[PDB]
Amino acid sequence: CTLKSFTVEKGIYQTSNFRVQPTESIVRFPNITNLCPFDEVFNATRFAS
Amino acid sequence: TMSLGAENSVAYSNNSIAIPTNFTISVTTEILPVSMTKTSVDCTMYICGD
After folding, report:
1. CA distance B37 to chain A (A)
2. Residues of A whose CB is below 8 A from B42
3. Which of A25, A46, B11, B46 sits at 20 to 30 Å (Cα–Cα) from B26?
4. Contact B44 A17 (CB under 8 A)
5. B42 in Cβ contact with A17 (< 8 Å)
6. How far is CA B17 from CA B3, B11, B12, B22, B24, in A?
7. Nearest CA to B45 among A19, A21, A13?
8. Is A41 helix (H, G, I), strand (E, B) or coil?
9. Is the Cβ pair B45, A17 closer than 8 Å?
10. Degrees (nearest 5) of the Cα angle B30, B36, B42?
């Protein structure tokens, strides 16, 4: 198919290229730190007026 | 200004010839390339990467 001829001569011919497609996909981000004080804000006795 | 070489003046008498009396076997060298490195580009990878 890469050559317009049904009678291929003797030799080596370069066909289309191959590419191994990936299977898995990982997304690694930096460690979770520096939390917010919202846990202490929403927990009190006298909040505001 | 570059010099084209030495300025030698060979005699040109009517009857005079220079016959060598000694021989010197010299071995020179010449560098000539034969071929390059065979390469082949990926027309589907260089144009589009992932």
Report:
1. 18
2. 17
3. B11
4. yes
5. yes
6. 29, 9, 9, 16, 20
7. A19
8. helix
9. yes
10. 170
